[PDB]
Write a protein that binds this ligand. Sequence first.
Ligand SMILES: *[C@@H]1O[C@H](CO)[C@@H](O[C@@H]2O[C@H](CO)[C@@H](O)[C@H](O)[C@H]2NC(C)=O)[C@H](O)[C@H]1NC(C)=O
Ligand SMILES: *[C@@H]1O[C@H](CO)[C@@H](O[C@@H]2O[C@H](CO)[C@@H](O)[C@H](O)[C@H]2NC(C)=O)[C@H](O)[C@H]1NC(C)=O
Lengths: 49, 49
Amino acid sequence: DLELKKERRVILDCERDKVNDIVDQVITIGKHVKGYHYIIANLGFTDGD
Amino acid sequence: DLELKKERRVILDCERDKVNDIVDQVITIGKHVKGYHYIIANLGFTDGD
Ligand SMILES: *[C@@H]1O[C@H](CO)[C@@H](O[C@@H]2O[C@H](CO)[C@@H](O)[C@H](O)[C@H]2NC(C)=O)[C@H](O)[C@H]1NC(C)=O
Ligand SMILES: *[C@@H]1O[C@H](CO)[C@@H](O[C@@H]2O[C@H](CO)[C@@H](O)[C@H](O)[C@H]2NC(C)=O)[C@H](O)[C@H]1NC(C)=O
């Protein structure tokens, strides 16, 4: 559904557990190549993997 | 080095252990989007993940 408007820019506002799950599902579906842009909206940016 | 000739088509001839490692490194560097082609050259195609 996020490809209906051809979205290139995603802001993730989750805690230290859901950020890892969303990143793992992005890597599984393959949406981390150059052309995309993500912002992990938290204070512990290096707390995730 | 495989992006010097802009290679789109890779044939992997490895056993049941190295195929999983090469696929994991392809997923880590992000080369499994639409546009690339792969052939797992073995008899146990469904033996890997
Ligand atoms: C980082 O992600 C952003 C968003 O996709 C992109 O930044 C663009 O970088 C180019 C090259 O300097 C600029 O000309 C554009 O103005 C930037 N903003 C856009 C397209 O909104 C780019 O894809 C990524 N890389 C860099 C180096 O910025
Ligand atoms: C994914 O599968 C498609 C369809 O099976 C392949 O697309 C080929 O594209 C060429 C060039 O447009 C056309 O001859 C046909 O649309 C397809 N060829 C066939 C069916 O023999 C594509 O090569 C595959 N691999 C990718 C995208 O990496």
